[PDB]
Amino acid sequence: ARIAGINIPDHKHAVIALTSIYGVGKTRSKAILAAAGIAEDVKISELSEGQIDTLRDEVAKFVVEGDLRREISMSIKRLMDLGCYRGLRHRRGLPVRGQRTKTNARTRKGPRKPI
Template sequence: MSSEFKYIVRVAGVDLPGDKALAYALADIKGIGVSTAQAVAIKLGLDPKRLLGTLSDEEIEKLSNALREIEKLGLPAWMLNRRKDPFLGVDRHLITSDLLITVRNDIEFMKKIKSYKGTRHMLGLKVRGQRTRTTGRTGLTVGVKRGKETPQQQKKGE
């Protein structure tokens, strides 16, 4: 068993800092939050407050395999990030590039079927019901344009 400290640890294909607590280091992986990281660590019998760099190679391998197949750990379905997948019909948890690709495909599907959300995505507008009157403005700024000063305004300025 190696007792040396690792400053960079590769878990589930992502380089993580070894000087962070296990739960917070795992939260740097796309698709894993602090709550999920703590739940996974506890299920594997690891202390979530322990520094990631102090884990042995076997524990890192065990952790990496568990993160790739979180559904098999027996966590409640509400902790998974893809419940009732519309195409597969099962509860799944996606991480890293799998999550990014799936979200991009979902948006493309919404655009293809021309749902309300898909149309909002196409137009580059807010999708989740936020106000658009004052926020989310992009493009050229619109302001008040000053015209030529009248003789009366010139006298007031002097």
């Protein structure tokens, strides 16, 4: 119930639980379970410690949690200090993939700031 250094829920099925690892979604969770030979509908608190060890080994293959976080952070910071268009967009906290900013863009710009 502690894979890649984080607590994962014991009450949920294995596929749903493994998605709690920052870096594993449904697809990677299914791949991990298949490679470790564990049913997709089994609940975490009902796996043998050997099975959890194998799961640890599998999830160790992929970059997750802190390593992934700092990888993403160094990619963003490289964009930043290069100061290309995407670096400038990231600095200003505006949409980065060519969306419209005349309206919407609330996810990047934050909620309404009245004048």
